[PDB]
Amino acid sequence: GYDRALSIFSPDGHIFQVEYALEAVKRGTCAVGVKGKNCVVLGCERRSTLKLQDTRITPSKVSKIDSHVVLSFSGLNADSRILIEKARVEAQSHRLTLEDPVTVEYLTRYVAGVQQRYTQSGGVR
Amino acid sequence: MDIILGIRVQDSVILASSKAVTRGISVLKDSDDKTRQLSPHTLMSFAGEAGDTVQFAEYIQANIQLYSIREDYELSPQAVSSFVRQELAKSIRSRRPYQVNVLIGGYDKKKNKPELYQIDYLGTKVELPYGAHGYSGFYTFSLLDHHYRPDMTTEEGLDLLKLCVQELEKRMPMDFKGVIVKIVDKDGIRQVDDF
Amino acid sequence: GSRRYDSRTTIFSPEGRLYQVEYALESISHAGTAIGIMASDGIVLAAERKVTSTLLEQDTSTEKLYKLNDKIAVAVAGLTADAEILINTARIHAQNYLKTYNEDIPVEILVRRLSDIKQGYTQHGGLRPFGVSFIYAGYDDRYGYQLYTSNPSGNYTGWKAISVGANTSAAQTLLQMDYKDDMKVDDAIELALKTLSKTTDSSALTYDRLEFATIRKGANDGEVYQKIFKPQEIKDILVKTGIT
Amino acid sequence: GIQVDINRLKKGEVSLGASIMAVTFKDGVILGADSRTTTGAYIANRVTDKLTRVHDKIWCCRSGSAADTQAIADIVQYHLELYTSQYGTPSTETAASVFKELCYENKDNLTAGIIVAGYDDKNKGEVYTIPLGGSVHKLPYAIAGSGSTFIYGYCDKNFRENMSKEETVDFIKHSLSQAIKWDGSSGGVIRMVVLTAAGVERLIFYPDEYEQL
Amino acid sequence: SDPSSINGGIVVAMTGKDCVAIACDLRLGSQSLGVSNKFEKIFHYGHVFLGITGLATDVTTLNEMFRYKTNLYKLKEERAIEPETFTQLVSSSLYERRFGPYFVGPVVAGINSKSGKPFIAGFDLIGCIDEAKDFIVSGTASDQLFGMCESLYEPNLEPEDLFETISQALLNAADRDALSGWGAVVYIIKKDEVVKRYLKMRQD
Amino acid sequence: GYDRHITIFSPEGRLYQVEYAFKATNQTNINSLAVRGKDCTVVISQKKVPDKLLDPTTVSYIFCISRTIGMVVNGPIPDARNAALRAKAEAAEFRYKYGYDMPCDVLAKRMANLSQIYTQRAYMRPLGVILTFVSVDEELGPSIYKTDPAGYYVGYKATATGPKQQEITTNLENHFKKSKIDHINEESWEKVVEFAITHMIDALGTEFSKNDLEVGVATKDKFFTLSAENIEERLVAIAEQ
Amino acid sequence: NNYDGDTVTFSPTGRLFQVEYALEAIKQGSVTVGLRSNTHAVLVALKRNADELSSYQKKIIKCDEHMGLSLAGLAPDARVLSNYLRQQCNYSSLVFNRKLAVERAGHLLCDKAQKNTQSYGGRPYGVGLLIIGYDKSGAHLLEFQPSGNVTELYGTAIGARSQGAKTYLERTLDTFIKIDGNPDELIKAGVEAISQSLRDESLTVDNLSIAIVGKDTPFTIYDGEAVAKYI
Amino acid sequence: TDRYSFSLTTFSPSGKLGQIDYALTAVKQGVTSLGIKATNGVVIATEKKSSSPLAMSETLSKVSLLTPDIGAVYSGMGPDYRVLVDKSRKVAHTSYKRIYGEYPPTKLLVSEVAKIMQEATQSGGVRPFGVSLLIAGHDEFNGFSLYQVDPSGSYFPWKATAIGKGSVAAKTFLEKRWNDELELEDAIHIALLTLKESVEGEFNGDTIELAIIGDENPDLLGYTGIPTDKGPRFRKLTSQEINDRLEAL
Amino acid sequence: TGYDLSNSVFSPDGRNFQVEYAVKAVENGTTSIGIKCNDGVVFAVEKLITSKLLVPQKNVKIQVVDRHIGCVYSGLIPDGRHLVNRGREEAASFKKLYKTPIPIPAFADRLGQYVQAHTLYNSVRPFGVSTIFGGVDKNGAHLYMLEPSGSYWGYKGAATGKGRQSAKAELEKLVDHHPEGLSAREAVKQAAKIIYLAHEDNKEKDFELEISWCSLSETNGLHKFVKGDLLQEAIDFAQKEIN
Ligand SMILES: [Cl-]
Ligand SMILES: [Cl-]
Ligand SMILES: [Mg+2]
Ligand SMILES: [Mg+2]
Ligand SMILES: [Mg+2]
Ligand SMILES: [Mg+2]
């Protein structure tokens, strides 16, 4: 298996691969989240250099993880699908063992844990 | 043993399932619901080896719910039944097979038709107007051959079902503590509380 | 050890870009142009063969257009060898779905899985990405006629009309100009060919330098037919639209 | 009895119940065997060759399962050919060790009663016997197979060390003659193989001769 | 406990003059209990027909498997699979599961589109091919079918006459078997047309 | 320029590591020669023992691969022995699996395919050796097949290998132009060895003692190497004519 | 320079720089002293602290009832190697009912350290060890270096300014070797030896660390008020 | 252990795959080989560049049988070709004949070979194959066909083509001579003419290697009895058979 | 260039510079020798006394393989130990399968192939030792010397280390003056002398002598160390010759 340590420290104490990943997020379309008294609203930007699009079938920017939780993102589109899939699986697994749907904090903690694991695992970015 | 029945009528599918859970010479529970909702318009009843039944039902339930979230779309009863059959078909040649028999009652929203599938633990699928697993069939099939009509209403189907339960209560050796009845139609799944 | 010779294919640049994905897209931009146009009653796939030789066997050839199943087809842009690896995977995935659910695979599901495979080669494994861009053209009973595109990054998007490969900038402008929503298949056929005829690097567009296909509901009553055009059928449709 | 030797075989497999023996003498060593192979009471092959070459001047007598002994002998021949390419001619002891290793390590799955016999120039004639368990036993002479039970008495009384070639051939002929006469699993022709400094000589003896001894 | 006779069922195939026929019963049971009278055992992939008797779950599984394999075949080969080739594919696939086999008795039937020659073939559960000019039989009433076919069959029958012979063979065999019957289907296959007929038989 | 360190293509379509493996061949500074007779195949090689402390009997570049096959190597002894051990194993396995002795040309192909793998796979380096296989094959008769680090192999009427290979090659070429045949028309192997030594003396221009040469002979059903006294006897016969 | 990237590379003069850089980590480590007579063997170690608010880094580790070592360099690497020694001592007891010889202990450490200097990916151990013990052939003192080299000695010292203590022991060789049947006098000689490596700092109660093993003495470590006797 | 688990072939900033381009440069250096398709057959041919006159050129076969109805020839690196032929023969059995009980059609075997060459372009710790193949073959439903396969794994069907040293000139020569009404004997004649241009030294049956895919050969089958089995369509022309056609040239 | 940075890489000469660099490590090490005699072999080695604190006689460098083979080496001592550990596994599996103890030529190739294997990949380093070894088998006495490249030959006499040229010169004289052969007891005495003469190339630190031997008559074909009276007798002989 490909083992190379791609994410590593530099003399000044930075992990450049993690910081360059943040630049990819800075390139991505804008996403905003605002929570009110009895609701939360997720807003998302869609760049208008793409005409002749089919909005029926084009992947939506906001994704349902379970019937009560949603996930939006900014950055690489292909990467986001992998996190969403893992999160959806974990959401069903939680209902199966705990007999109760995930909390928003738990689902976040899981997704954040996956992201972290890719910062100190060999062979991955 | 356990009693699970199914009757497809004009506009709905009706599933009846026994409430008794027996271990040894003791009826441990008399209010057990031997079914899981796989999707808003698909219901699966089950019966067989202890432990295996619920473990299998919930495993399927989780997989169908995962599909629904991923595609934001409900799988047809035919598609769900085929998925369930394949899982049982894999299972039978495993180290330890699931000894579970199921009935899948669903309402296909695209076709606007009710559908009833009977699948045994070997992975043997059949679509039927009426179905049953275990020793129940030895009484209910011949009874339904006589009394069943294809164009019946949901109310006529419930009276036809009452006729089955009465016969089973009369001639079955074991006390199965009545049945929980559920109806699947265009408006989804609901339970008949007084039976 | 071996560290010395590792290119590190799956890393970020300081600007937050994937080197190998960007360079794979640069490769694809030199490939023969492929166009997809979606109409209300069907889909058109048109593609330009890469500088044809007169002694090339044209009728028994397949370079650009491939069949994934009875309802779905793809137009290729990039390395053909790479595309065939992905095509056979896609063909198998479609048959796995049919075996499991006794229903033809929904177009998006097939596209997503094929795009997820490409994504994997950019995040792990230390291998180079697939130098291929697809245009997916297919039909299902949920969304009807659909056009998608995927590229080496593993990102996919849906389209009404789209081009991949060479001169996409010029091609997309022309499509954006003449396309409209209430369009028919026969009109879309004419748009596809006219667009290629103007964006082509060749002197004149001829039958022997093209691949063409349609996905209509033109079969008898509520069923979809895939037509991969023969050489003579392309020759006829080229005269009928007044290009030659 | 002999049954638990034959009770070992897999159902329906060819049986190599046998009258095999190897005898050292002044000039070297002689291997001897019958030619009968059975499937129950049917003789599958009446002209079998149970004396088999694993090296130029290292041979073995096979008994038990035909399949198992053949598979083993083929592997041993392979090992000794590879040994010769690297280290030169192997000793008879070395050959017996390779046989033992296969028989012992696979003692549960195998039924192979093998006698190993060879000629060195330093060590002269040597005989090693390897029974079912996978143990090794170096002896002046050895007998084995279903028919050997009937000639323990005869062979012990008649064997002498430093016999001549003609005497040893007579000793083997008379012995196997009796083993064949009494054992139903043994019969056919009496094959022999002579191992000396002179080379390798094959001998055969037919019923009409040995029966009326 | 005997996989091949839990569900029950029968398939038979015959050749005629420039045609083939394949027929099956409709019963699916659980030992003594009859469960379904709509369970067809004949499938087709292009112009090649496959009938399968034995354990019902494996009948279903193998149909889905050969649909899978013939679809990929068509995409790669750019043509429909022929009966002779398909027969080999069935044999390979069954023997792949030599020491954990599908409990089935499949039967291939069809006409080669190139040569026009009528073709039939049968298999055991581990994939031993049984080729035949005249007829192939399979299922819980195989003995009965062998008896009916051997006596009723004659070579070079016309499609209309062949229909009567195969139908009478299946019906009278099924009525002497407890686990077979409950309806029947007969396929008559010509070079470029295929007729499917449902037979009236006793429902006990 | 890391394309010169591992086995990948250079801009001009070359594999430099393979080319440098060829130069390692002549590191020992030994010349070899192989010829075919009617019933036999003879291979000869120079033997150079510079150090006085060496046991000359252990200094050898000829190997007995199987009973029938012999192999002479041009190149460093560690790689030579590496190749010899593998060839011995492959020949033994072939006999066990397929029930007959591995032919000389089949073994050559097998070792050549192994050599090819080292030219394509990066982690394995090529062996810096040229393997010359000789036998009297039961189907094809007297045979000479030679393998190099590139994975190339071919049969030979006769051949030579080493630093002064070209001089030996043309010497043999001129003989076969004259004789008009593919082999040495000679009954006994003894005189085929005498031919081989004589033509090496003419080509190289040096005289040989019994300890300056190493000889291998292949006949039907056995390959063997000659002792110092066997060669001395052979050198006497050349001098007396 | 160009030949110090990894352990798998030789320099043009035949040196392994990654092994030499591991050796350098030992020189930076705090001083520790080892010495033995015929009856007993003694380890003396100067412990080091981060600051006045911190504890003093423990230098001595027990391996068995009859064996143990002191460390100098990377402490986690000493923990790995000492753990390996504990298992090997223990394997010898469970399988052979036999106390592991101090010489074999050294051989096992050598071979473990060596494998890390010939393979790609791994690294050499960054610690030096002084192993003492009493077995069937009397008292023993070993010196382990992460190059693989293990050496049996009467006395030695490793760490920063270890040359001072090593010179003292070289002078005192004839005296301390004959301190038989007297633990306290052998320790005194070790405490005086380590004192030749001190600069500005002196031996205090929570600074000094002593260990001993012998004929009728199991391997025991002395810290805190228990070493106040020897100041 | 093999620590090279990463790609040795990668995209350069310009979008080139360097190792594939360099492999094609190796093919350019290689000796000329060609293929021509007729109405009733296919011909493939090449020059036998001998390394030494002492070497027996008969033992080195540049034209190889893959199946009874499919043959192959190359230009580029000979050792790479040899192992591809070994792998190509085996894959014809494992992934087809052992499944369908019959030999694969030309296009599919070609597809399997291309897959092997594509993997050497992407897999870890390997370089691409330094060869271009020409594969001629026949099968019942597709008839006669001729394919080229490149180091990238790309393959194209041809009416006629040439690869290697003098391919540019050879392809021009074939464009003038090729028509859709060519008989097999005419295609062999044109092949020899085309090849004479690229060959410099001796030009005879001993220096030229040439094989055909034509009619079935019952005599080359080795047995009789089964009517359906009619023999291999692949036949390698002998040294004598070539020289006969060089007289009436 | 850069051809010397990685192992298993050919230079344009056709050389593996990493192996040549390992030879430099061997040349840096202490002197060790081997002497073949009438019916056996003798091994000897130079042990540099770094300090008074080194326990005499208790840092043994010569190693035994099986019961009949002796091994000594110069260079990186741990690399030599690793090689001997492999040798013992090779000798163990040979005796396990073939019953007879491993022959010396057979044993020599087992080491040779193992050392050669470490010149095939860049993921491993070549061995930093030249190993002199041998013993007595069925075919008589054998002496071998194995180098970092994997190259080995049979020897009448062998030497390696910092004083190899001095030892080689002294060995060449013994071969010339004793064509019929040298006895086992004589070879022990000569071995001592040659180490003392070879110590002139390493004369800063004084040294400790260590000798071992295998002989069909003297040691019954088994490997033994030279100790006590026989060792002191050999030292006295060497002391008398330098003066
Ligand atoms: Cl036998
Ligand atoms: Cl091979
Ligand atoms: Mg008898
Ligand atoms: Mg019936
Ligand atoms: Mg009935
Ligand atoms: Mg390489």
Domains of chain F from N-terminus onward: 1-241 (3.60.20.10)
Chains that touch G (3 or more CB pairs under 8 A): C, I
Ligand nearest to the CA of I8: 6
Q: Could you give the angle at the alpha carbon of B158 between the alpha carbons of B156 and B164, nearest 5°?
A: 110
Q: Which of B133, B190, B131, B142 is nearest to B167 (CA)?
A: B142
Cβ pair E72:C98 closer than 8 A: no
Chains that touch C (3 or more CB pairs under 8 A): A, B, E, F, G, H, I
Q: Give the span between the Cα atoms of D207 and B190, in whole angstroms.
A: 93
Tokens of H88: 């190509």
On whether any CB of chain F is under 8 Å from the CB of I109, the answer is yes
On whether any CB of chain F is under 8 Å from the CB of H30, the answer is no
Q: Give the span between the Cα atoms of D14 and D17, in whole angstroms.
A: 9
Q: Give the span between the Cα atoms of I139 and I153, in whole angstroms.
A: 17
Tokens of I149: 């490249």
Q: Give the span between the Cα atoms of H63 and H70, in whole angstroms.
A: 11
Cβ pair A4:H124 closer than 8 A: no
SS3 content of chain I, % helix, strand, coil (to 5): 40, 25, 35
Contacts with H6 from chain A: Cβ below 8 Å? 2, 4
Cβ pair D78:F96 closer than 8 A: yes
**Catalytic site positions of I:** 30
Q: Which domains does chain C have, with CATH numbers?
A: 1-244 (3.60.20.10)
Decide if F219 contacts F40 (C-beta within 8 A).
Answer: yes
Q: Which residues pair with I154 in a beta bridge?
A: I144
Q: Which residue of B has its CA nearest to A70?
A: B69
- What element of type H or E holds I92? helix I77-98
Torsion, Cα C5 C11 C14 C18, to 10 degrees, reads 110
Which of I76, I85, I86 to mutate: most G Cβ within 10 Å?
I76
On whether any CB of chain G is under 8 Å from the CB of I24, the answer is yes
Chains that touch F (3 or more CB pairs under 8 A): C, D, H, I
Strands, sheet with F41-46, edge to edge from the N-terminal-most edge strand = F158-161, F32-36, F41-46, F213-219, F222-225
Q: Which residue of C has its CA nearest to B85?
A: C100
Angle between helices H78-92 and F104-120 (to 10 degrees): 100
Chain B: give the shortest CA distance to residue C142, in Å.
9
**Domain limits, chain E:** 1-204
Q: Which of I17, I120, I118 is nearest to F126 (CA)?
A: I120
Q: Look at residue E29 and give its three-state secondary structure.
A: strand
CATH number of D1-213: 3.60.20.10
Strands, sheet with B42-48, edge to edge from the N-terminal-most edge strand = B35-39, B42-48, B100-108, B113-119, B125-127
- Fold of the CATH domain H1-249: Glutamine Phosphoribosylpyrophosphate, subunit 1, domain 1 (3.60.20)
Q: Look at residue D56 and give its three-state secondary structure.
A: coil
Q: Look at residue C38 and give its three-state secondary structure.
A: strand
Q: Any idea what DSSP says for residue A39?
A: -
Contacts with G120 from chain C: Cβ below 8 Å? 1-2
Q: Give the span between the Cα atoms of C224 and I218, in whole angstroms.
A: 97
On whether any CB of chain C is under 8 Å from the CB of G121, the answer is yes
Farthest-apart Cα atoms in chain E, separation: 47
Q: Which of H156, H227, H163 is nearest to H194 (CA)?
A: H163
Farthest-apart Cα atoms in chain H, separation: 63
On whether any CB of chain F is under 8 Å from the CB of H206, the answer is no
Q: Give the span between the Cα atoms of A77 and A66, in whole angstroms.
A: 20
Ligand nearest to the CA of E182: 4
**The CATH number fitting domain E1-204, selected from 3.40.50.2000, 3.30.2320.30, 3.40.605.10, 3.60.20.10:** 3.60.20.10
Contact partners, residue H98, CB within 8 Å, separation at least 6 = E92
Cβ pair E76:H99 closer than 8 A: no
On whether any CB of chain C is under 8 Å from the CB of E68, the answer is yes
Chain C: give the shortest CA distance to residue A17, in Å.
6
Tokens of I114: 């193992």
On whether any CB of chain D is under 8 Å from the CB of I95, the answer is no
Tokens of B131: 């179905």
Q: Which of C211, C232, C168 is nearest to C76 (CA)?
A: C211
Residue E1 Cα to ligand 5 midpoint, Å, equals 20
Q: Give the span between the Cα atoms of A33 and A72, in whole angstroms.
A: 9
Q: Which domains does chain G have, with CATH numbers?
A: 1-231 (3.60.20.10)
Chain E: give the shortest CA distance to residue C40, in Å.
27
The residues whose Cβ lies within 5 A of ligand 2, an ion, are: F 113
On whether any CB of chain F is under 8 Å from the CB of I148, the answer is no
Contacts with F57 from chain I: Cβ below 8 Å? 154
Q: Look at residue E191 and give its three-state secondary structure.
A: coil
- What element of type H or E holds B58? helix B52-71
Q: Give the span between the Cα atoms of F27 and I151, in whole angstroms.
A: 13
Concatenated DSSP letters of H184-220: HHHHHHHHHHHHHHH--S--STTTEEEEEE-S--GGG
Chain C, residues 108-137, CB within 8 A of chain A, namely: 108, 112, 115-116, 118-119, 122-127
Q: Which of C120, C81, B98 is nearest to A118 (CA)?
A: C120
CB crowding C168-202: b at 16 or more within 10 Å, else e: beebbebbeeebeeebebbbbbbbbbbbbbebbee
Query: Is the Cα torsion angle B60, B62, B65, B66 positive or negative in sign?
Result: negative
Q: Give the span between the Cα atoms of D98 and H77, in whole angstroms.
A: 45
Q: Give the span between the Cα atoms of F64 and F224, in whole angstroms.
A: 7
Q: Which residue of C has its CA nearest to A75?
A: C16
On whether any CB of chain H is under 8 Å from the CB of A3, the answer is yes
- What element of type H or E holds A105? helix A104-117
Q: Give the span between the Cα atoms of I241 and I200, in whole angstroms.
A: 13
Torsion-angle region of H101 (φ positive above 0: left; ψ -120 to 50: alpha; else: beta) = left
Q: Any idea what DSSP says for residue B95?
A: S
- Total residue count of chain H as it appears in this document: 249
**Domain limits, chain H:** 1-249
Decide if I98 contacts D92 (C-beta within 8 A).
Answer: no
Torsion, Cα H27 H29 H30 H35, to 10 degrees, reads 70
Tokens of G42: 């003694």
Cβ pair E61:B92 closer than 8 A: no
Q: Give the span between the Cα atoms of F215 and A81, in whole angstroms.
A: 71
Q: Which of C74, C48, C53 is nearest to C198 (CA)?
A: C48
Does domain I1-243 bear CATH number 3.40.50.2300? Answer: no
Query: Is the Cα torsion angle H218, H219, H220, H225 positive or negative in sign?
Result: positive
Q: Any idea what DSSP says for residue F112?
A: H
Q: Look at residue G80 and give its three-state secondary structure.
A: helix
Decide if C54 contacts H175 (C-beta within 8 A).
Answer: yes
Q: Which of E12, E54, E6, E5 is nearest to E147 (CA)?
A: E12
Residue I10 Cα to ligand 2 midpoint, Å, equals 25
Decide if G187 contacts G224 (C-beta within 8 A).
Answer: no
Contacts with D86 from chain I: Cβ below 8 Å? 106, 109
Torsion, Cα A104 A106 A108 A111, to 10 degrees, reads -140
**Which is it for strands F213-219 and F222-225: parallel, antiparallel or unpaired?**
antiparallel
φ, ψ for residue I16, nearest 5 deg: -105, 90
Chains that touch E (3 or more CB pairs under 8 A): B, C, H
Cβ pair E60:B123 closer than 8 A: yes
Q: Give the span between the Cα atoms of C47 and C38, in whole angstroms.
A: 15
**Domain limits, chain D:** 1-213
**Domain limits, chain I:** 1-243
Query: Is the Cα torsion angle F198, F199, F203, F208 positive or negative in sign?
Result: negative
On whether any CB of chain F is under 8 Å from the CB of C220, the answer is no
Residue I15 Cα to ligand 6 midpoint, Å, equals 15
Report the Cα D20 to chain-centroid distance in Å: 5
Q: Which of A66, A93, A96 sits opposite B69 (nearest CB)?
A: A66
Contacts with F124 from chain I: Cβ below 8 Å? 120-121
Residue type, G194: I
On whether any CB of chain B is under 8 Å from the CB of E128, the answer is no
Decide if I31 contacts I194 (C-beta within 8 A).
Answer: no
Q: Which of B73, B71, B84, B36 is nearest to B184 (CA)?
A: B36
- What element of type H or E holds G213? strand G208-214
Q: Which residues pair with H76 in a beta bridge?
A: H131
Contacts with G8 from chain C: Cβ below 8 Å? 1
- Total residue count of chain E as it appears in this document: 204
**Which residues in C have their CB inside 8 Å of a CB on E?**
67-69, 91-92, 95-96, 98-99, 102
φ, ψ for residue F109, nearest 5 deg: -60, -45
On whether any CB of chain D is under 8 Å from the CB of I99, the answer is yes
- What element of type H or E holds F142? strand F141-147
Q: Can you point out the beta strands (E) in C60-200?
A: 65-67, 72-78, 132-140, 144-150, 156-159, 161-164
Cβ pair A58:C125 closer than 8 A: no
Concatenated DSSP letters of chain H: -----SBS--B-TTS-BHHHHHHHHHHHHSPPEEEEE-SS-EEEEEE---S-TTEETTTS-SSEEEETTEEEEEEE-HHHHHHHHHHHHHHHIIIIIHHHSSPPPHHHHHHHHHHHHHHHHHSBTBPPP-EEEEEEEEETTTEEEEEEE-TTS-EEEBSEEEESTTHHHHHHHHHHH--TT--HHHHHHHHHHHHHHH--S--STTTEEEEEE-S--GGGTS--S-SS----SEEEPPHHHHHHHHHT-
Cβ pair E77:H98 closer than 8 A: no
CB crowding I90-104: b at 16 or more within 10 Å, else e: bbeebeeebbbbbbb
Q: Give the span between the Cα atoms of D34 and D49, in whole angstroms.
A: 8
Q: Which of D83, D86, D78, D82 is nearest to D53 (CA)?
A: D78
φ, ψ for residue B11, nearest 5 deg: -120, 10
Cβ pair C5:F123 closer than 8 A: no
Chain H: give the shortest CA distance to residue F160, in Å.
10
Decide if F73 contacts F131 (C-beta within 8 A).
Answer: yes
Q: Which residue of C has its CA nearest to F124?
A: C2
Torsion, Cα H231 H233 H234 H238, to 10 degrees, reads 80
Q: Give the span between the Cα atoms of C140 and D203, in whole angstroms.
A: 83
To one decimal, the resolution in angstroms is 2.9
Q: Which domains does chain B have, with CATH numbers?
A: 1-195 (3.60.20.10)
Place of tokens 């050879």: H170
Q: Give the span between the Cα atoms of H73 and B60, in whole angstroms.
A: 55
Decide if B41 contacts B55 (C-beta within 8 A).
Answer: no
Chain H: give the shortest CA distance to residue C186, in Å.
31
Q: Give the span between the Cα atoms of A73 and C27, in whole angstroms.
A: 29
Query: Exposed (0-12), middle (13-18) or buried (19+): which is G57, by Cβ within 10 Å?
Result: middle
Decide if B49 contacts B65 (C-beta within 8 A).
Answer: no
Residue B122 Cα to ligand 4 midpoint, Å, equals 24
